Design a binder for this molecule. Structure first.
Ligand SMILES: Cc1cc2nc3c(=O)[nH]c(=O)nc-3n(C[C@H](O)[C@H](O)[C@H](O)COP(=O)(O)O)c2cc1C
Ligand SMILES: Cc1cc2nc3c(=O)[nH]c(=O)nc-3n(C[C@H](O)[C@H](O)[C@H](O)COP(=O)(O)O)c2cc1C
Ligand SMILES: CCN1C(=O)C[C@H](SC[C@H](NC(=O)CC[C@H](N)C(=O)O)C(=O)NCC(=O)O)C1=O
Ligand SMILES: [Zn+2]
Ligand SMILES: [Zn+2]
Lengths: 336, 336
């Protein structure tokens, strides 16, 4: 229906099995009598022949499909398919396997956004296993692989070619009601940049230098998120831990944030009264770790923006609250 | 000095390049004239020939090496090398590339602990890009891949055969001084289980069922960690967000934690004066998000154990605090 997979070897099988687990229906283009049994069990419609055939492509539903996964092993065949689909089926999104760097480059030049070098991530994993058996902790080792990946991707992309900042930290931005409205409203302003952490770093691999650059340009920084267990989401905590670095956000020479302002914009399921609990009751006390973090780094902490009772929230209330968020924002701009 | 890499093609080049960035000393076994220049450029010592020659293995220093990375592509040659090494060099840890499920199985049977199927992680990434191109959030997609990975590994492992609970959340357990001593002390008690989050889940993919089972068996739960930015590490917060689930920890029928105790055991680099910051100063205030979480889940909140001044801490002070932690734990179990 929405998905076509070309090639059902080792690579296509795992990609297909992951989609099938997530409830996605697909058809397969394959031409290996060896895969007949695998295909039988897999239980999807099969088009048996060369994927480069226009007739098989059309009968597979290419003119209506959203995504083609090009899992073809042979670079020449893999590229020929890519070129055919680009020419004949302009709305069909190509996700491609690449054999190696030369193949990756040719795919990039054919307009595939992020071709996946078939052994790359396996090889990085193997590197981490070696690091761990040499005595490195698994997390430090994964971080080292993350740094190398970013570097390597930047190098191969070069070979191929050859003021408000909202730090948004909802884990499921597509599923958001309250925060999503707040952001729609904020974008109607100017000099607003939005960085959605769970969209940028689903693998919890923050690019510190990219984050520091954006902060450098901002006058007001906003930490916007749904409250989770009286606190913030894991990825926002990671962002603080990584981005607010020694010699940059604090410590000797760490003055990059001095003079800037910070707003906490948080949504909660409960209402004010729910926070009257424990030794230090009241919603305002929960701002403490954040305010302490901001102050330590030389930021000016603003009165938080807080939207309560999203659990029982009227759509009329969701709107007025979102517009007051924009209003807080506008008012800060006019003062600065 | 420490590592031998057999095979320096696409796969072996990435693995060895990663290790170079970590300053690891390695020698290479490779027979491909096309790789000679690459190897010379990195300054790499090469033993040219079949990695399956005993005399080459010996010359490469296999009798002293800590780790062999078997990056050979050909499954037969790859397996021959594995079995030869296992027979003759008993202290040499083998990290091996696997072509597919069958190769993976034969490596397991040869005594390789975690063979890495070469295209597996690459395919999962391709599957994630397809899901995202269909409109799924990048983070939700990654989470689907994590579930798929966990299930797949368990399946391939099947085929290959054919009370105190400390939740420890130091991001760098090996680099620790204060927490390491505390865990040394705690371990001298009876009925202690330690789960080290950053060792168990470097890729931040928590196994909720396993954590919940461990919690089932605990009477005292301890959150133990160094304090970072007035709060807790990113992985502990994920652990809370994931493991303290609707219908288990809270909400209708969520009574699994009722009657259990929770202790916060935290180390800080600053003393008490460090926490004279913000509108709600004082160290005790910082426990509020955690105490509120405890209360909502029916956990019994105990007075925290806090070790301060680790930045300026004498070694006798460190020992003494590690003994006092053991003491708190002991008196708890003597009281229950
Ligand atoms: C993991 C989890 C923990 C939560 N913890 C709290 C809580 O501490 N206090 C509270 O009021 N709401 C809590 N909530 C409710 C969310 O804050 C609320 O659903 C959210 O702000 C709604 O905004 P949204 O429509 O943008 O998702 C929690 C929700 C989840 C999913
Ligand atoms: C990311 C980062 C943030 C930190 N923030 C704080 C802070 O909030 N307050 C504090 O007293 N110490 C802070 N520290 C210092 C650690 O708490 C301290 O080094 C640790 O408790 C020592 O424990 P260890 O020897 O087991 O590593 C921070 C350290 C790091 C790495
Ligand atoms: C269990 C479900 N199922 C079936 O019904 C039959 C296939 S069998 C396992 C598969 N093997 C091959 O494709 C053989 C490749 C080869 N011989 C080659 O050298 O190229 C494979 O490894 N796939 C990637 C993975 O799983 O890691 C399958 O996946
Ligand atoms: Zn989403
Ligand atoms: Zn470590």
């Amino acid at each position: 229906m929405r998905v076509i997979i070309a090639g059902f070897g080792r690579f296509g099988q795992i990609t297909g099995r992951l989609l099938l687990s997530s409830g996605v229906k697909m058809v397969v283009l394959d031409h290996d009598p060896d895969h007949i049994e695998t295909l039988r069990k897999f239980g999807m419609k099969v088009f048996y022949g060369d994927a480069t055939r226009m007739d098989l492509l059309e009968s597979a539903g290419a003119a209506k499909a959203e995504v083609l996964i090009n899992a073809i092993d042979d670079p020449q065949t893999n590229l020929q398919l890519t070129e055919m689909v680009k020419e004949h089926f302009p709305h069909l999104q190509i996700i491609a396997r690449a054999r190696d760097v030369d193949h990756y480059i040719r795919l990039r030049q054919a307009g595939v956004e992020k071709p996946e070098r078939e052994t790359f991530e396996g090889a990085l994993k193997t590197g981490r296993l070696a690091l761990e058996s040499l005595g490195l902790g698994p997390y430090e080792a994964r971080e080292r692989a993350d740094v190398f990946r970013r570097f390597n991707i930047q190098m191969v992309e070069e070979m191929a070619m050859v003021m408000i900042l909202i730090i948004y930290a909802h884990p499921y931005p597509h599923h958001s009601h309250a925060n999503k409205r707040m952001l729609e409203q904020a974008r109607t302003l100017e000099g607003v940049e939005i960085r959605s952490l769970y969209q940028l770093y689903p693998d919890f691999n923050i690019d510190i230098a990219a984050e520091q650059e954006a902060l450098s340009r901002a006058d007001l920084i906003v930490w916007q998120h749904p409250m989770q267990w009286y606190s913030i989401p894991p990825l926002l905590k990671l962002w603080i831990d990584k981005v607010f670095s020694h010699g940059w956000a604090y410590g000797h020479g760490g003055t990059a944030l001095h003079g800037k302002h910070l707003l906490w914009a948080v949504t909660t399921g409960g209402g004010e009264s729910h926070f009257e609990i424990g030794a230090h009751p009241g919603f305002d006390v929960l701002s403490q770790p954040l305010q302490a973090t901001a102050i330590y780094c030389g930021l000016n902490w603003l009165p938080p923006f807080a939207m309560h009772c999203t659990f029982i929230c009227d759509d009329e209330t969701l709107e007025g609250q979102a517009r007051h968020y924009k209003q807080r924002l506008l008012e800060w701009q006019e003062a600065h």
